[PDB]
Design a protein around this nucleic acid. Sequence first.
RNA 1: GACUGUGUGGUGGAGUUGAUGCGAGUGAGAAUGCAGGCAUGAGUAGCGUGUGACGGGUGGGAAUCCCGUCCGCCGAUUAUCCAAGGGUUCCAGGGUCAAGUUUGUCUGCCCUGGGUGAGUCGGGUCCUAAGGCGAGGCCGACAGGCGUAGUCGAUGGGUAACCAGUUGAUAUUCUGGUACCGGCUUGUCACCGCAAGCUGCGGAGGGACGCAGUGAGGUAGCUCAU
RNA 2: GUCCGAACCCACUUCAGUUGAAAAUGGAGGGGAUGAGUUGUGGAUAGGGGUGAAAGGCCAAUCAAACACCGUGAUAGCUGG
RNA 3: AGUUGGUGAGCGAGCUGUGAUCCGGGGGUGUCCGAAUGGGGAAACCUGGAAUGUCCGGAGUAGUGUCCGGUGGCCCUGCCCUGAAUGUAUAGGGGUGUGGGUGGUAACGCGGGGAAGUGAAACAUCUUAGUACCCGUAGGAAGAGAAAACAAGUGUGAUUCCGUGAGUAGUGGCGAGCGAAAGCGGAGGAGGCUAAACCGUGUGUGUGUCAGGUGUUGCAUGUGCGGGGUUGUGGGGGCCUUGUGGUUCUGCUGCCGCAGGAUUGGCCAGUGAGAAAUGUUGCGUGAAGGUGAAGCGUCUGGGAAGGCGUACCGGAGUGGGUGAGAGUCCUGUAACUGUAAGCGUGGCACUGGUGUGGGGUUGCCCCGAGUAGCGUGGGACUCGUGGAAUUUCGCGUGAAUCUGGCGGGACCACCCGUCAAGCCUAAAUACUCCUUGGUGACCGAUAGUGGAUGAGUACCGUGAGGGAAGGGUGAAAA
Lengths: 95, 69, 60, 106
Amino acid sequence: ELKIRDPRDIILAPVVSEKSYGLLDQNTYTFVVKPTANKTEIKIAIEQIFGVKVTSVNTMNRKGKVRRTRTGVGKRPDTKRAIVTVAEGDRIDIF
Amino acid sequence: KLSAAELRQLSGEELRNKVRELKEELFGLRFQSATGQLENTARLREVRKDIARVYTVLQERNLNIVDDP
Amino acid sequence: AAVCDICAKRPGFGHNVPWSKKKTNRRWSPNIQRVRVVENGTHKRMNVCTSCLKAGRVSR
Amino acid sequence: MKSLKIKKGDRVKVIAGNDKGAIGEVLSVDPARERVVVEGVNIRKHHGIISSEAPIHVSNVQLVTKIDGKDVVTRVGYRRVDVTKRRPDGSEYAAQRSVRYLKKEE
RNA sequence: GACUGUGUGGUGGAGUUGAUGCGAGUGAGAAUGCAGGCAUGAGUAGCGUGUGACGGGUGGGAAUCCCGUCCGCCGAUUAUCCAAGGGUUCCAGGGUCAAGUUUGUCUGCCCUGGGUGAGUCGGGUCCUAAGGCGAGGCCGACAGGCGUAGUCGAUGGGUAACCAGUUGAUAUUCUGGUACCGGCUUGUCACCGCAAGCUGCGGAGGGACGCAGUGAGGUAGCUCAU
RNA sequence: GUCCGAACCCACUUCAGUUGAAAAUGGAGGGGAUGAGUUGUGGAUAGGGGUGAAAGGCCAAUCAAACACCGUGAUAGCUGG
RNA sequence: AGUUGGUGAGCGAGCUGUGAUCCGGGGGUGUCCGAAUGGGGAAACCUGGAAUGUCCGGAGUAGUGUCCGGUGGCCCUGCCCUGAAUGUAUAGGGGUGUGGGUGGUAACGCGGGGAAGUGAAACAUCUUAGUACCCGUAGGAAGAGAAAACAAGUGUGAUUCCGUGAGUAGUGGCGAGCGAAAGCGGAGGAGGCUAAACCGUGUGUGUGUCAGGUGUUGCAUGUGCGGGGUUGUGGGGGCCUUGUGGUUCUGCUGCCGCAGGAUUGGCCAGUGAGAAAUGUUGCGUGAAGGUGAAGCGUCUGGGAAGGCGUACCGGAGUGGGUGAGAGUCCUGUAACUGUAAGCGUGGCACUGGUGUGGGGUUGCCCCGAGUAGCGUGGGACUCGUGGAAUUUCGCGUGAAUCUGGCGGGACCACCCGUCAAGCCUAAAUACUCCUUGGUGACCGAUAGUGGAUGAGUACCGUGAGGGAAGGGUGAAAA
Ligand SMILES: [Mg+2]
Ligand SMILES: [Mg+2]
Ligand SMILES: [Mg+2]
Ligand SMILES: [Mg+2]
Ligand SMILES: [Mg+2]
Ligand SMILES: [Mg+2]
Ligand SMILES: [Mg+2]
Ligand SMILES: [Mg+2]
Ligand SMILES: [Mg+2]
Ligand SMILES: [Mg+2]
Ligand SMILES: [Mg+2]
Ligand SMILES: [Mg+2]
Ligand SMILES: [Mg+2]
Ligand SMILES: [Mg+2]
Ligand SMILES: [Mg+2]
Ligand SMILES: [Mg+2]
Ligand SMILES: [Mg+2]
Ligand SMILES: [Mg+2]
Ligand SMILES: [Mg+2]
Ligand SMILES: [Mg+2]
Ligand SMILES: [Mg+2]
Ligand SMILES: [Mg+2]
Ligand SMILES: [Mg+2]
Ligand SMILES: [Mg+2]
Ligand SMILES: [Mg+2]
Ligand SMILES: [Mg+2]
Ligand SMILES: [Mg+2]
Ligand SMILES: [Mg+2]
Ligand SMILES: [Mg+2]
Ligand SMILES: [Mg+2]
Ligand SMILES: [Mg+2]
Ligand SMILES: [Mg+2]
Ligand SMILES: [Mg+2]
Ligand SMILES: [Mg+2]
Ligand SMILES: [Mg+2]
Ligand SMILES: [Mg+2]
Ligand SMILES: [Mg+2]
Ligand SMILES: [Mg+2]
Ligand SMILES: [Mg+2]
Ligand SMILES: [Mg+2]
Ligand SMILES: [Mg+2]
Ligand SMILES: [Mg+2]
Ligand SMILES: [Mg+2]
Ligand SMILES: [Mg+2]
Ligand SMILES: [Mg+2]
Ligand SMILES: [Mg+2]
Ligand SMILES: [Mg+2]
Ligand SMILES: [Mg+2]
Ligand SMILES: [Mg+2]
Ligand SMILES: [Mg+2]
Ligand SMILES: [Mg+2]
Ligand SMILES: [Mg+2]
Ligand SMILES: [Mg+2]
Ligand SMILES: [Mg+2]
Ligand SMILES: [Mg+2]
Ligand SMILES: [Mg+2]
Ligand SMILES: [Mg+2]
Ligand SMILES: [Mg+2]
Ligand SMILES: [Mg+2]
Ligand SMILES: [Mg+2]
Ligand SMILES: [Mg+2]
Ligand SMILES: [Mg+2]
Ligand SMILES: [Mg+2]
Ligand SMILES: [Mg+2]
Ligand SMILES: [Mg+2]
Ligand SMILES: [Mg+2]
Ligand SMILES: [Mg+2]
Ligand SMILES: [Zn+2]
């Protein structure tokens, strides 16, 4: 069957902000994930990609902001964010 | 820029290794884009076009559009 | 019923025409009877018209 | 859609506008909007701001040739020639192409 | 006469004049006519229950923003937390065209970025009520109506977690401590064996049920204290 | 289907409001307030039909036959232009 | 030779000419919903496979959670097994996917149901109008169609459509209104099968048939399949006078003759409706392209296409752009040209596929039945129940069959025409959601589409639904 599926299809990008950087102090990484991926799939994919033992994966759905511009109401995409808590010393290098 | 003519000379297993390598490169490019790196924003689209090329070669071998080595 | 399972006979539509000719819409239904039939060894009920009963088109 | 008869790097003479009679090398072409930038002709502003050439209509310039010591403006024609075109796989095959020639110089 | 000059300026910046014919979406003052723009009333009525005062700050600008001190007000609610509904209004920074019945440096407004974390909470993954749909089927000229087997459908039944701490914005969700529930696997003990067990399938028990009323034993709370 | 009386449901009188704070309310009193009570959630009945402790009442702020669209540019011995 | 769509640029690229972008053709991918189809559902969501080595294959884990792909909706239908109460059997049940279906679609078609406002100066017959709407169902068109016809004495000869006939004849509370047909002029221009008689062919079963020959030698009925047959001053079957294309030679009837049989003619006839459907060769094209003529100098101007001067092309002076008004600056235009490709399309040749009658006779036999008529209650016809022909629906009743049936406006007789109760048929006709090219004494932003812009949007409404307004700097953003 065509279309090899990759763990890297599920972890889109890291989330870099003040809250994420403060979470990195407690070995916790925030990623944007495919909106159709569950916590177990995300956990397995993170373990496969980063070679790290994962103690927890939490998820939230962040609705996209709505702004009125010319051409009317424009809508930013809805995203799913996975917050991954990692073993005591394992570390993830997101660069 | 990969060429479909070159990929048509490769075999199936190395073509799929190429698919996985391109997926890994796209992953790294997206992470660099998120973190403020990636001066080279054209490779971000070109790697996906390369993935499409390899999939086209693999599927034309699967569907017998071109003879499969 | 008003539809024959044999020959597909269905009601007609016409007028009540009184002495004053004030027409009203009305129906003519076929004389449908529900009878027991045994066709190819199968026993069942059928709504058949008396015209197909008289013609012998139904196996009782 | 196809291209224009004026290409980048051509030597043209302006036949209409403020700089009528000027001769310059075509620096860049805009095939969609039929406007070309001719070297040293339409000097205006852009955007501590660069002052540079501006595009004029491609119909305001004409290709120029030196016949007997003077620059004279000519129209162009096309003649079909046999060439060998190459496919993406590297295979070669015979085909035809159009080569531009200047009139007034045969 | 409807009108008009081939007079003469100004503005304007791409069409149009006369003769003779041809064709009209060819003429407006009114239809409580339709659309737009603008008057009159008129700088007039109102500015939507109410208690604010002062000191300092910010700022181009302050009664109306921020801080403080007095004083007053609600307190079975002018408090705190949810459901429904709304949908980013939340937080931080920048802003003062518009909005705010005034001003505004302010804002539930504008722009940019950020923010919502669950095995146990509320739903699904469980169960059914009313009701809906409904294989076959029955009824009906056609369209369609009803309904069996079933399948949905909470406003109900069932189901395992608490306290403390932390942010600008989340917290029975994160963190610390201490628990519980269902799986998977594993060390170990004990027992089975027409005749182990597992799953289906049902029987029965159970779930399982009204209203009103009094008393007893407690506990939360509250009050006082040498 | 007891009595007085809050919440709650209602709406008897009066004053105000009447370009309202509000296309039915506010102030002051007033009736019921364990019952034929009130209320949340979902559901059923649909237009010559529904529902009605019955007023031609109500059926999404004008119901002696809702609303929308279509027949349709209905028709008007009438008014206006 | 530039290019990474637009509103609306610079980054980083690729083409860096190893020809990209681009254009035509064909493919690949194609999340989720939607007939929506594994199950559920508030569309774009949720949720799955009893127990087992797990629904099947693969990936991953120690294992379970997990991931990727597949399969399984329902209805009809075909094929196979089993056959309830119960006996035959059938209903039902169990395997297989054999085929078809489901839903959408602007107009046009066919069949069916069917208003009212309105007009009648009221209103009920009537009109509106078989309109609006609704239901079922197509096709590229549909429907009709090859005389149970018209005509009127000679004749025409399937259907459909247009023009006349004609607002006539009629019809009508003889009110308001409605309203033919024959004939004639045209567009188009096919005709084809079948039922049955009779002949070859099994099961509710044989005691009679010169090579032959047996209580049957092929004897009896009524299915299916093949021949035959297909017409109306009747035809066909049967009985015969004869004729098949040249045969290698197998049967039955009379060692006459009839038929299966075969590379090789063929008058024929073909992809058609025609009782049917299978390849290689032969032209020009739409989808893309290609070539495509011929002007300079001065003046004024921001700018020349304008003025002045003087030259060219024209199978091209239709247009439109360009800084003002261009035949010769651009785009093009006339003319020619290419078309690889199409599912290409049309047509021809060959291959390959299928295949005759004429004269005589009426002994006999067939020629479409619950059909036609009749009565009754309705409908369409000029015809509104009448003198009511013709045609059609419901309910009853119910033929003849060629020395017969039907029609020619009640009905009967003669005459004329015709042969119903089976089927299929092109073109002329209708329409335009769409695609390509073009046109206008059509509009020009209150117009023309509701919509020149985020337009079926904002907004309003629970909902069905309703529904706007907003264009212009400049030659160039300079
Ligand atoms: Mg969660
Ligand atoms: Mg009888
Ligand atoms: Mg190419
Ligand atoms: Mg060219
Ligand atoms: Mg004139
Ligand atoms: Mg007018
Ligand atoms: Mg006026
Ligand atoms: Mg007026
Ligand atoms: Mg004023
Ligand atoms: Mg004053
Ligand atoms: Mg006054
Ligand atoms: Mg006053
Ligand atoms: Mg005042
Ligand atoms: Mg204060
Ligand atoms: Mg107080
Ligand atoms: Mg929310
Ligand atoms: Mg915001
Ligand atoms: Mg807002
Ligand atoms: Mg805020
Ligand atoms: Mg702020
Ligand atoms: Mg203000
Ligand atoms: Mg502020
Ligand atoms: Mg139920
Ligand atoms: Mg059904
Ligand atoms: Mg449920
Ligand atoms: Mg609940
Ligand atoms: Mg908070
Ligand atoms: Mg807590
Ligand atoms: Mg915790
Ligand atoms: Mg039980
Ligand atoms: Mg019990
Ligand atoms: Mg009970
Ligand atoms: Mg006590
Ligand atoms: Mg104390
Ligand atoms: Mg009481
Ligand atoms: Mg009382
Ligand atoms: Mg009341
Ligand atoms: Mg309801
Ligand atoms: Mg009354
Ligand atoms: Mg109301
Ligand atoms: Mg009324
Ligand atoms: Mg009425
Ligand atoms: Mg009408
Ligand atoms: Mg589904
Ligand atoms: Mg479904
Ligand atoms: Mg299983
Ligand atoms: Mg009627
Ligand atoms: Mg009427
Ligand atoms: Mg009238
Ligand atoms: Mg009248
Ligand atoms: Mg079709
Ligand atoms: Mg037809
Ligand atoms: Mg004629
Ligand atoms: Mg036969
Ligand atoms: Mg040319
Ligand atoms: Mg000139
Ligand atoms: Mg009539
Ligand atoms: Mg009759
Ligand atoms: Mg007759
Ligand atoms: Mg007669
Ligand atoms: Mg016949
Ligand atoms: Mg036909
Ligand atoms: Mg056409
Ligand atoms: Mg306007
Ligand atoms: Mg308009
Ligand atoms: Mg204007
Ligand atoms: Mg709404
Ligand atoms: Zn019948």
